Protein backbone atom coordinates (compact mmCIF):
# COMPACT_ATOMS: atom_id res chain seq x y z
CA UNK A 1 0.00 0.00 0.00
CA UNK A 2 1.41 3.37 -1.07
CA UNK A 3 -1.39 5.52 -2.46
CA UNK A 4 -3.59 4.39 0.42
CA UNK A 5 -1.91 6.58 3.04
CA UNK A 6 -1.24 9.29 0.46
CA UNK A 7 -4.85 9.66 -0.69
CA UNK A 8 -6.15 9.62 2.88
CA UNK A 9 -3.85 12.51 3.79
CA UNK A 10 -4.85 14.45 0.67
CA UNK A 11 -8.55 13.99 1.45
CA UNK A 12 -8.14 14.89 5.12
CA UNK A 13 -6.21 18.03 4.17
CA UNK A 14 -8.97 19.22 1.84
CA UNK A 15 -11.88 18.17 4.06
CA UNK A 16 -10.31 19.99 7.00
CA UNK A 17 -9.92 23.23 5.03
CA UNK A 18 -13.51 23.18 3.78
CA UNK A 19 -14.57 22.44 7.37
CA UNK A 20 -16.38 19.25 6.40
CA UNK A 21 -17.88 16.95 9.09
CA UNK A 22 -16.70 13.42 9.97
CA UNK A 23 -19.49 12.23 7.64
CA UNK A 24 -17.02 12.93 4.83
CA UNK A 25 -13.75 11.57 6.22
CA UNK A 26 -15.34 8.47 7.77
CA UNK A 27 -17.16 7.68 4.53
CA UNK A 28 -14.20 8.38 2.24
CA UNK A 29 -11.98 6.15 4.40
CA UNK A 30 -14.47 3.29 4.10
CA UNK A 31 -14.87 3.78 0.35
CA UNK A 32 -11.17 4.13 -0.50
CA UNK A 33 -10.48 1.08 1.65
CA UNK A 34 -12.36 -0.99 -0.93
CA UNK A 35 -11.49 0.85 -4.16
CA UNK A 36 -7.76 0.61 -3.39
CA UNK A 37 -8.05 -3.18 -3.26
CA UNK A 38 -9.39 -3.42 -6.79
CA UNK A 39 -7.85 -5.59 -9.50
CA UNK A 40 -8.33 -3.06 -12.29
CA UNK A 41 -7.41 -0.09 -10.11
CA UNK A 42 -3.88 -0.57 -8.79
CA UNK A 43 -3.66 3.07 -7.81
CA UNK A 44 -3.23 4.58 -11.27
CA UNK A 45 -4.02 8.12 -10.15
CA UNK A 46 -3.90 8.74 -6.40
CA UNK A 47 -5.37 12.24 -6.69
CA UNK A 48 -8.16 10.99 -8.95
CA UNK A 49 -9.22 8.05 -6.78
CA UNK A 50 -9.02 10.26 -3.69
CA UNK A 51 -11.35 12.83 -5.25
CA UNK A 52 -13.64 10.06 -6.49
CA UNK A 53 -14.31 8.73 -2.99
CA UNK A 54 -14.47 12.30 -1.66
CA UNK A 55 -17.27 13.18 -4.10
CA UNK A 56 -19.26 10.08 -3.11
CA UNK A 57 -18.83 10.95 0.57
CA UNK A 58 -20.22 14.48 0.20
CA UNK A 59 -22.86 13.31 -2.30
CA UNK A 60 -25.65 13.54 0.27
CA UNK A 61 -24.32 15.23 3.40
CA UNK A 62 -21.34 17.45 2.71
CA UNK A 63 -21.94 18.98 -0.71
CA UNK A 64 -22.09 22.79 -0.38
CA UNK A 65 -24.91 23.11 -2.95
CA UNK A 66 -22.35 22.59 -5.72
CA UNK A 67 -19.26 20.46 -6.24
CA UNK A 68 -17.57 23.54 -7.71
CA UNK A 69 -17.11 25.02 -4.23
CA UNK A 70 -14.91 22.04 -3.34
CA UNK A 71 -13.29 21.48 -6.75
CA UNK A 72 -9.91 22.38 -5.27
CA UNK A 73 -8.45 18.94 -5.93
CA UNK A 74 -10.89 18.03 -8.72
CA UNK A 75 -8.63 19.74 -11.27
CA UNK A 76 -6.27 16.85 -11.96
CA UNK A 77 -6.88 13.40 -13.49
CA UNK A 78 -10.58 14.27 -13.58
CA UNK A 79 -11.08 11.44 -16.07
CA UNK A 80 -10.00 8.80 -13.56
CA UNK A 81 -12.03 10.50 -10.84
CA UNK A 82 -15.32 9.86 -12.60
CA UNK A 83 -14.02 6.48 -13.70
CA UNK A 84 -13.63 5.13 -10.17
CA UNK A 85 -16.69 7.07 -8.98
CA UNK A 86 -19.15 4.96 -10.99
CA UNK A 87 -17.57 1.80 -9.59
CA UNK A 88 -18.35 2.67 -5.97
CA UNK A 89 -21.56 4.59 -6.76
CA UNK A 90 -23.29 1.36 -7.82
CA UNK A 91 -21.85 -0.53 -4.87
CA UNK A 92 -23.93 1.11 -2.15
CA UNK A 93 -27.24 2.93 -2.56
CA UNK A 94 -29.35 4.46 0.20
CA UNK A 95 -32.43 2.92 -1.47
CA UNK A 96 -34.39 6.13 -0.91
CA UNK A 97 -35.68 5.97 -4.49
CA UNK A 98 -38.85 4.14 -3.47
CA UNK A 99 -41.28 6.99 -2.76
CA UNK A 100 -41.09 10.21 -4.79
CA UNK A 101 -44.79 11.02 -4.30
CA UNK A 102 -45.13 13.45 -1.39
CA UNK A 103 -43.14 16.29 -2.95
CA UNK A 104 -46.42 17.64 -4.35
CA UNK A 105 -46.51 19.91 -1.30
CA UNK A 106 -42.99 21.36 -1.82
CA UNK A 107 -43.59 23.91 0.98
CA UNK A 108 -42.23 21.56 3.66
CA UNK A 109 -39.02 21.27 1.63
CA UNK A 110 -38.34 24.95 2.36
CA UNK A 111 -38.90 24.48 6.11
CA UNK A 112 -35.12 24.60 6.57
CA UNK A 113 -35.09 28.42 6.56
CA UNK A 114 -35.60 28.53 2.79
CA UNK A 115 -37.35 31.62 1.32
CA UNK A 116 -40.35 31.13 -0.96
CA UNK A 117 -38.29 32.89 -3.64
CA UNK A 118 -36.59 29.55 -4.20
CA UNK A 119 -39.97 27.80 -4.23
CA UNK A 120 -41.37 29.92 -7.06
CA UNK A 121 -38.11 29.64 -8.99
CA UNK A 122 -37.94 25.86 -8.58
CA UNK A 123 -41.43 25.32 -10.01
CA UNK A 124 -40.45 27.30 -13.10
CA UNK A 125 -37.30 25.26 -13.58
CA UNK A 126 -39.18 22.00 -13.11
CA UNK A 127 -41.95 23.06 -15.50
CA UNK A 128 -39.50 23.76 -18.33
CA UNK A 129 -37.79 20.41 -17.78
CA UNK A 130 -41.00 18.39 -17.30
CA UNK A 131 -42.83 19.92 -20.26
CA UNK A 132 -39.80 19.14 -22.40
CA UNK A 133 -39.44 15.66 -20.86
CA UNK A 134 -35.68 16.13 -20.66
CA UNK A 135 -35.34 13.40 -18.04
CA UNK A 136 -37.72 10.44 -18.53
CA UNK A 137 -35.72 8.24 -16.17
CA UNK A 138 -38.16 8.63 -13.28
CA UNK A 139 -41.29 10.79 -13.06
CA UNK A 140 -42.37 14.48 -13.28
CA UNK A 141 -42.45 14.55 -9.47
CA UNK A 142 -38.74 13.75 -9.15
CA UNK A 143 -37.94 16.74 -11.35
CA UNK A 144 -39.76 19.05 -8.94
CA UNK A 145 -37.66 18.08 -5.92
CA UNK A 146 -34.49 18.26 -8.00
CA UNK A 147 -35.51 21.68 -9.28
CA UNK A 148 -35.75 22.91 -5.69
CA UNK A 149 -32.09 22.02 -5.24
CA UNK A 150 -31.14 23.66 -8.54
CA UNK A 151 -33.07 26.79 -7.57
CA UNK A 152 -31.24 26.90 -4.24
CA UNK A 153 -27.91 26.51 -6.03
CA UNK A 154 -28.59 29.42 -8.38
CA UNK A 155 -29.73 31.48 -5.37
CA UNK A 156 -26.44 31.03 -3.48
CA UNK A 157 -28.14 28.69 -1.00
CA UNK A 158 -25.81 25.95 0.21
CA UNK A 159 -28.20 23.07 0.82
CA UNK A 160 -27.49 19.35 0.91
CA UNK A 161 -29.25 16.37 -0.71
CA UNK A 162 -29.88 14.91 2.74
CA UNK A 163 -32.74 17.35 3.34
CA UNK A 164 -34.61 16.23 0.22
CA UNK A 165 -33.73 12.59 0.76
CA UNK A 166 -34.66 12.20 4.43
CA UNK A 167 -36.59 15.29 5.59
CA UNK A 168 -38.58 15.67 2.37
CA UNK A 169 -38.89 11.91 1.99
CA UNK A 170 -38.80 12.02 -1.79
CA UNK A 171 -35.67 10.30 -3.11
CA UNK A 172 -32.04 11.34 -2.70
CA UNK A 173 -30.64 9.55 -5.76
CA UNK A 174 -33.64 10.86 -7.71
CA UNK A 175 -32.06 14.32 -7.62
CA UNK A 176 -28.92 12.96 -9.26
CA UNK A 177 -31.04 11.09 -11.82
CA UNK A 178 -32.93 14.25 -12.74
CA UNK A 179 -29.78 16.38 -12.69
CA UNK A 180 -28.21 14.00 -15.20
CA UNK A 181 -29.17 14.55 -18.84
CA UNK A 182 -31.38 17.50 -17.96
CA UNK A 183 -28.73 19.88 -19.29
CA UNK A 184 -27.58 19.67 -22.94
CA UNK A 185 -24.56 21.91 -22.39
CA UNK A 186 -25.68 24.55 -19.92
CA UNK A 187 -28.45 24.92 -17.28
CA UNK A 188 -31.02 25.86 -19.93
CA UNK A 189 -33.79 25.23 -17.43
CA UNK A 190 -34.53 28.93 -17.01
CA UNK A 191 -37.75 30.14 -18.70
CA UNK A 192 -37.59 33.93 -18.39
CA UNK A 193 -38.36 34.87 -14.79
CA UNK A 194 -35.08 33.32 -13.68
CA UNK A 195 -32.67 36.26 -13.69
CA UNK A 196 -29.95 33.94 -12.32
CA UNK A 197 -28.71 35.18 -8.93
CA UNK A 198 -25.33 33.48 -9.18
CA UNK A 199 -23.71 34.78 -12.41
CA UNK A 200 -21.06 32.08 -12.71
CA UNK A 201 -22.26 30.90 -16.15
CA UNK A 202 -20.04 27.82 -16.18
CA UNK A 203 -21.80 25.76 -13.52
CA UNK A 204 -20.94 22.07 -14.01
CA UNK A 205 -21.36 19.32 -11.37
CA UNK A 206 -24.40 20.42 -9.35
Amino acid sequence: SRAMMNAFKEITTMADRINLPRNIVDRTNNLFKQVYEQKSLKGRANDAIASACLYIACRQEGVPRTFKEICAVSRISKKEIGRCFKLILKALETSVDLITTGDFMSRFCSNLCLPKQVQMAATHIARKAVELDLVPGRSPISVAAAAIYMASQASAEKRTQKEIGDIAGVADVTIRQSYRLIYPRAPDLFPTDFKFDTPVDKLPQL
Binding site: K78, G82, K86, R185, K202, Q205
Partner: peptide, 26 residues
Protein backbone atom coordinates in the same frame (compact mmCIF):
# COMPACT_ATOMS: atom_id res chain seq x y z
CA UNK B 1 -22.58 -5.36 -17.60
CA UNK B 2 -22.48 -3.33 -14.39
CA UNK B 3 -18.68 -3.33 -14.31
CA UNK B 4 -18.71 -1.90 -17.84
CA UNK B 5 -20.08 1.32 -16.38
CA UNK B 6 -17.03 3.37 -15.37
CA UNK B 7 -16.45 6.21 -17.83
CA UNK B 8 -20.10 7.23 -17.58
CA UNK B 9 -19.19 9.56 -14.70
CA UNK B 10 -15.89 10.55 -16.32
CA UNK B 11 -17.78 13.03 -18.47
CA UNK B 12 -19.37 14.31 -15.27
CA UNK B 13 -15.97 14.98 -13.74
CA UNK B 14 -13.56 15.88 -16.54
CA UNK B 15 -15.80 16.77 -19.49
CA UNK B 16 -18.01 18.81 -17.16
CA UNK B 17 -15.39 21.53 -16.79
CA UNK B 18 -13.66 20.81 -20.10
CA UNK B 19 -16.83 21.37 -22.13
CA UNK B 20 -18.09 23.93 -19.64
CA UNK B 21 -15.26 26.24 -20.66
CA UNK B 22 -15.90 25.58 -24.36
CA UNK B 23 -18.83 27.98 -24.58
CA UNK B 24 -16.91 30.34 -22.32
CA UNK B 25 -13.61 30.18 -24.17
CA UNK B 26 -13.10 33.92 -24.32
Amino acid sequence: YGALDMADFEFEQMFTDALGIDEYGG
